[PDB]
Amino acid sequence: IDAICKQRGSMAGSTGVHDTVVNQLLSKIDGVEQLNNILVIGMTNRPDLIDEALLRPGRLEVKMEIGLPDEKGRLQILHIHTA
Amino acid sequence: DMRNELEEMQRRADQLADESLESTRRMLQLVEESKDAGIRTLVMLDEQGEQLERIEEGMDQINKDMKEAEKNLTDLGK
Structure with missing residues (x-):
């Protein structure tokens, strides 16, 4: 989305x-x-x-951050890819 | 050292059309209809010319017959 939407002006x-x-x-x-x-x-x-x-409120207004997993997440991913 | 320089980008204005597809189709349809009407007129005109040519011979024959008959009757009468 950042390719299309950038701050007005600044171009x-x-x-x-x-x-x-x-x-x-x-x-x-x-x-x-x-x-x-x-x-x-x-x-x-x-x-x-x-x-x-x-x-801002009304537009979008719910934002999630996906971070690096933990030991349990690593175990689950390895199990999924080795099944 | 606040000396900036720029580069340019270009955009092409839409080519000449988007009004040549509504009047155009109607124009073509009307042209086709006029062509058909002209063909029909051609055929009818040729037929009429043939009929007039046919009439001419009968006209000439009747003229000759009447003239000859009148001359013969006058000759016998006197």
């Missing part, structure tokens, strides 16, 4: 295509028309590069 180009995309996405997810039968899942390696606006 050196005349076309300005990296801002209209973000604005259209923001309008569609949360606009005047109320659409409530959709769920969007976005995964990334660098949460910082994501535009701050998308991370």
